[PDB]
Point group: C3
Chain length 135, copies 3
């Protein structure tokens, strides 16, 4: 179980390196072909890689000379073939005028193993602490 | 030693998921029955689960529509039955009006194994960088 | 490979505990004797332990009653004897007047194993998101 814990962290790190450098297709390829990505509460999830890549192009043309970073911490995993991962995300956004911190986001991932033994994300369910607090 | 490193991270993650969702009793149950929690310098530590749960109800009624998050990083462990954990904490607090970042806190934990093989926290000793800098 | 992942995190944690407490010599001793440290883009890297310790004394006398913290997240490792580590750094600086957050920094480390089996840093290559965004 220790080895899976490190494997999930490695997989999440690679995922986010690709996302934050704008490689939206590489990011979608770390999801399963039917992968669910609910990135913002209220909005319906993107489902499948094509919908994921499209929803990231929407979100990023919508607000774009910017460098975002997603910092994951506080990972807890739980278990036939699938694993649930609960963790914290902190979003950072660097502009020429400075660095905006937030939001803070609890996230639940579900991972499965592919045919080649590599992990893939079946689902990612993001909450937003700012939006949770309003309600 | 690698496997213990992941086990400490998993245990700390579960602890803080319970604390940050206000499940103060679940949090106290991850400490030993005689567990020491020195959460703020100057103040005497809460000792035992009941004192821990009481001191968290004091601290949180004292300042409460809020969502706090504790992000742990930079874990280093050292060693018969006990393990010392040194790490960094960053506190985040989300209000309707926004997100306050800080303080930054170096923390020392001492963990032991219970009868059932699960880890428990014998002690947690928190420093506050803001208060350290004044002195 | 899981065990190396935890070993790199442990090594990075110890390195930064020494740096952030101003133990610049201990920090330089976690690098190889010919270790490369490019801490800021544009400036030439410090090479060897003596140059590292000197460049940290320059940087810190240059701006110093302060407590800095370096939080590492998002580690991904890749491979005869050497390992590459890509990760995120977030810098925190606590003053009497408050806490400044940033910058956010992608970092690449190269680690090797010493004669005694302990890891050492052959190179550390820091980028600055704020400076990357200007260009
Ligand atoms: C694009 C985006 C997010 C993410 O993509 C995300 C993620 O991929 C993994 C883990 C967490 C997240 C969190 C977010 C937050 C949201 C960004 C925003 O509201 O500024 O919209
Ligand atoms: C309630 C509280 C803290 C914690 O409980 C804490 C912790 O449980 C584990 C690791 C670190 C911490 C740090 C703190 C800081 C302190 C909060 C504040 O001063 O706002 O008071
Ligand atoms: C002293 C310093 C840095 C570091 O030393 C550093 C590091 O040792 C490991 C990993 C990342 C870093 C990042 C920095 C950033 C830079 C600090 C600044 O510009 O304020 O100058």
């Amino acid at each position: 179980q220790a080895a899976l814990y490190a494997e999930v962290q490695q997989h999440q790190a690679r995922q986010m390196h690709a996302l934050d450098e704008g490689k939206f297709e590489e990011y979608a390829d770390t999801f399963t072909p039917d992968g669910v990505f609910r990135h913002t509460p209220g909005r319906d999830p993107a489902i499948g890689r094509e919908a994921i890549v499209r929803e990231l192009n929407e979100f990023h043309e919508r607000y774009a000379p910017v460098q975002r970073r997603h910092m994951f911490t506080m990972l807890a995993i739980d278990e036939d073939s699938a694993v649930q991962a609960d963790f914290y995300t902190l979003v950072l956004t660097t502009r020429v005028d400075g660095l905006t911190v937030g939001p803070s986001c609890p996230v639940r991932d579900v991972l499965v193993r592919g045919a080649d033994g590599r992990l893939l994300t079946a689902s990612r369910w993001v909450e937003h602490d700012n939006r949770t607090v309003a309600e």
